[PDB]
């Protein structure tokens, strides 16, 4: 149940537009190999062609140790997330879009044999379960620190959120993540905000 999975997608019913993928990982002598993202194979499974249409592309990589927790971040771009090494995280999502699904959540364990498409407006987070993990993701717009005040965030430790972190009490978080607003102070995102 890590190697040799069939490429396949499942909708995440709580969060419209989100897709969870099984990625084939091929193992041998040396280690392993995957096609982490393959546009031609993934469009027919539901990966949105609208992802690449502005022609923008950026690939970010974080490397985190045990109990690090990063989130929850809902910037105005789409994300394709996966793990790039032998590590594992608890992936956590909260929908911050205006409407009936505001505050809807989903959680799942992500290793290199799973990926997630996260629509713009859905807050993304994770906590590391392994000793360390390489988290790699593709995005279709460009971040700027000076612009950070305009993106949406919600505080990881708000107890009204319908999530359970692996280890909240011992989480290693950034100063920024300690200070994001609680859910009751987040304005839901309209298509106009993305």
Residues 141-180 interacting with a copy of itself (rule: CB under 8 A): 142-143, 172-174
Q: Does 14 bind a copy of itself (CB under 8 A)?
A: no
Q: Does 34 bind a copy of itself (CB under 8 A)?
A: yes
Rg of the chain on CA atoms, in Å? 16
Residue 176 CB, shortest distance to ligand DAU, in Å, is 6
Residues 58-97 interacting with a copy of itself (rule: CB under 8 A): 58-65, 68, 70, 82, 84-86
Q: Does 39 bind a copy of itself (CB under 8 A)?
A: yes
Q: Does 2 bind a copy of itself (CB under 8 A)?
A: no
Q: Which residue in 80, 135, 137, 156 is the catalytic one?
A: 137
SS3 81: strand
| CA–CA distance, 76 with 63 (Å, rounded to integer) | 23
| CA–CA distance, 137 with 115 (Å, rounded to integer) | 9
Cα three-residue angle 151-153-156, rounded to 5 degrees? 160
Tell me whether residue 3 or residue 182 sits nearer to a copy of itself (CB atom): 3
| Region at 109 (left for phi over 0; alpha for psi -120 to 50; beta for the rest) | beta
| Region at 46 (left for phi over 0; alpha for psi -120 to 50; beta for the rest) | left
Q: 149 contacts which partner out of a copy of itself, ligand DAU, none, CB within 5 to 8 A by kind?
A: none
**Which residue carries 């809902």 as its tokens?**
74
Clarify whether 137 is annotated catalytic.
yes
Which one of residues 8, 57, 109, 147 is an interface residue with a copy of itself (CB under 8 A)?
57
Catalytic site positions: 73, 137
């Amino acid at each position: 149940n890590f190697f040799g999975k069939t490429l396949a997608a499942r909708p995440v019913e709580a969060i419209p537009g989100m897709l969870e993928f099984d990625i084939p990982v091929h193992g041998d002598n040396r280690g392993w190999f995957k096609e982490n993202f393959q546009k031609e194979k993934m469009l027919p499974l539901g990966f949105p062609e609208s992802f690449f249409a502005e022609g923008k592309l950026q690939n970010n990589v974080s490397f985190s140790r045990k109990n690090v927790l990063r989130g929850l971040h809902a910037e105005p771009w789409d994300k394709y997330i996966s793990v790039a090494d032998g590590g594992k995280v608890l992936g956590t999502w909260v929908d911050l879009r205006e409407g009936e699904t505001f505050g809807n959540t989903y959680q799942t364990v992500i290793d290199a044999s799973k990926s997630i498409f996260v629509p713009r407006g859905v807050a993304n987070g994770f906590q590391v379960l392994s000793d360390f993990v390489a988290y790699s993701y593709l995005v279709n717009d460009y971040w700027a620190l000076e612009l950070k005040p305009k993106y949406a965030f919600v505080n990881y430790a708000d107890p009204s959120l319908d999530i359970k972190w692996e280890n909240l009490e011992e989480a290693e978080v950034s100063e920024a993540d300690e200070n994001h607003p609680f859910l009751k102070d987040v304005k839901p995102l309209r298509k106009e905000d993305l």
